[PDB]
Design a protein around this ligand. Structure first.
Ligand SMILES: *[C@@H]1O[C@H](CO)[C@@H](O)[C@H](O)[C@H]1NC(C)=O
Ligand SMILES: *[C@@H]1O[C@H](CO)[C@@H](O)[C@H](O)[C@H]1NC(C)=O
Lengths: 34, 34
């Protein structure tokens, strides 16, 4: 599935997590823009 | 964590619940104003 904010939650910054990577998390409210 | 709509679900009115208090729930779409 596409990485979305529906099945992902945010918790703190990425500096404390070992072995993290970078990729875009698609917010579905952005293509709507209603 | 701050009380947000993502981690709470609503079921009926608050007249039936015993010992319930009043507090604000943060709507995350309201500061977005999309
Ligand atoms: C992710 O991006 C930040 C900021 O551009 C960078 O400092 C970090 O090294 C990146 N992560 C990786 C694994 O390259
Ligand atoms: C909570 O709100 C209800 C309805 O406005 C009110 O009757 C009640 O006294 C309030 N309780 C507190 C602790 O403010």
């Amino acid at each position: 599935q596409i990485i979305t904010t529906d099945n992902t939650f945010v918790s703190g910054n990425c500096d404390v997590v070992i072995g993290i990577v970078n990729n875009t998390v698609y917010d579905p409210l952005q293509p709507e823009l209603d």
